[PDB]
């Protein structure tokens, strides 16, 4: 028995390290899928991105329609968002490592830069705002950061129309 | 006739049409383009189940393998919670005492269309209470009415939510072999 229960034990050992292999197999075809799809998708959100050009106050309406988006939303940087041009996720190419999302803003009483972006690591690495004289301030959120960064990547990305179109 | 003709005139001319336009002409181009995007979405989904259904169907005898061996050990699950970090915390040493009687755990997921989960706490007769079975599901969550003794009653407040089954679920059943040595 104090050897039967050091049988059982290891031979719980030996199921697990199966168990183990097929959870790895089974994540590793997983993320293959995921790779797949991230490159067949791309030439359809970069047309996708044209067309959106085309429709000024796109990613502040999009937005300002989500209701957690707008939970995050105040004043002065619902203003700022007049200038968003241009909302992009990109998922880097294996998808385990992260994604990045850009957010183009036009020449601006707020800051300097023409992007501003928030990048995601498997870690989070964000653009140094240059405030224009007097203007430091969701530009917090800018600086969990992986919550309002999953809700525009899995929400808001796939159909951000889904929200344009729906007060 | 001119009379009519004067109002259906006035009806078409001046009764925009640049912005408007555009604005709805690029909707209409991108739901075109999103039907594309959504059918690739829809693909790479059904390819993740498939992949999801074949290695459920391979791991599910080794689980059942896993639990058959796991009630020959005693106190096995004590101890796996006990070095859990997160659990261990929810440890007193009363329900630590009320564990040494647990035998067996199960976690079912029944996510084809959707049911949540459960998870099956089978214990050996013992001093605290008179079931066999404390189960509890989670969809919010239904759980076994614990019937205590007489002035034994009591981690086990879980039983009158969703942090500690996703922690048990998520966390140790793909592998409490690591808490149980670790
Ligand atoms: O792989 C299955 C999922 O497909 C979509 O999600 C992926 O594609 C999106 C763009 O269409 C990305 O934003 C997302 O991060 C990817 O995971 C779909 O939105 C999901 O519901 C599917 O499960
Ligand atoms: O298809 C049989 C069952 O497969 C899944 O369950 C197995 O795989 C899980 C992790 O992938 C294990 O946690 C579980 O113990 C296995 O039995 C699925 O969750 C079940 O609903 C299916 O019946």
Redesign the interface.
Same mark, same amino acid.
Do not use: C
């Given at each position: 028995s104090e050897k039967? +229960?050091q049988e059982?034990?290891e031979?719980?050992?030996e &199921?697990?390290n #199966?168990?183990?292999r =097929? $959870?790895e +197999?089974?994540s590793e #075809?997983?993320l293959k &899928? #995921?790779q797949?799809?991230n490159k /067949? @998708?791309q030439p359809?959100?970069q047309? @996708?991105s044209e =067309?959106?050009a085309?429709? *000024?106050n796109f990613w502040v309406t999009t937005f300002v329609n989500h209701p957690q988006v707008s939970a995050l939303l105040g004043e002065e940087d619902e203003e700022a968002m007049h200038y968003l041009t241009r909302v992009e996720v990109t998922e880097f190419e294996d998808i385990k490592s992260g994604y990045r999302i850009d957010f183009y803003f036009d020449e601006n009483p707020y800051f300097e830069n023409k992007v501003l972006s928030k990048e995601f690591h498997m870690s989070s690495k964000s653009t140094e705002i240059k405030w224009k004289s007097g203007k430091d301030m969701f530009f917090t959120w800018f600086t969990g950061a992986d919550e309002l960064g999953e809700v525009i990547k899995d929400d808001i990305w *796939? $159909?951000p =129309?889904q929200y344009? /179109?729906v007060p």
């Amino acid at each position: 028995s104090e050897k039967e +229960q050091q049988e059982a034990i290891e031979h719980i050992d030996e &199921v697990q390290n #199966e168990i183990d292999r =097929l $959870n790895e +197999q089974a994540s590793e #075809e997983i993320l293959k &899928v #995921e790779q797949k799809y991230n490159k /067949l @998708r791309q030439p359809f959100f970069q047309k @996708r991105s044209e =067309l959106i050009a085309k429709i *000024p106050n796109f990613w502040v309406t999009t937005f300002v329609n989500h209701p957690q988006v707008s939970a995050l939303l105040g004043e002065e940087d619902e203003e700022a968002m007049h200038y968003l041009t241009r909302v992009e996720v990109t998922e880097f190419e294996d998808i385990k490592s992260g994604y990045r999302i850009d957010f183009y803003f036009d020449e601006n009483p707020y800051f300097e830069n023409k992007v501003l972006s928030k990048e995601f690591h498997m870690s989070s690495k964000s653009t140094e705002i240059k405030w224009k004289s007097g203007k430091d301030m969701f530009f917090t959120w800018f600086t969990g950061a992986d919550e309002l960064g999953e809700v525009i990547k899995d929400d808001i990305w *796939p $159909n951000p =129309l889904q929200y344009y /179109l729906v007060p």
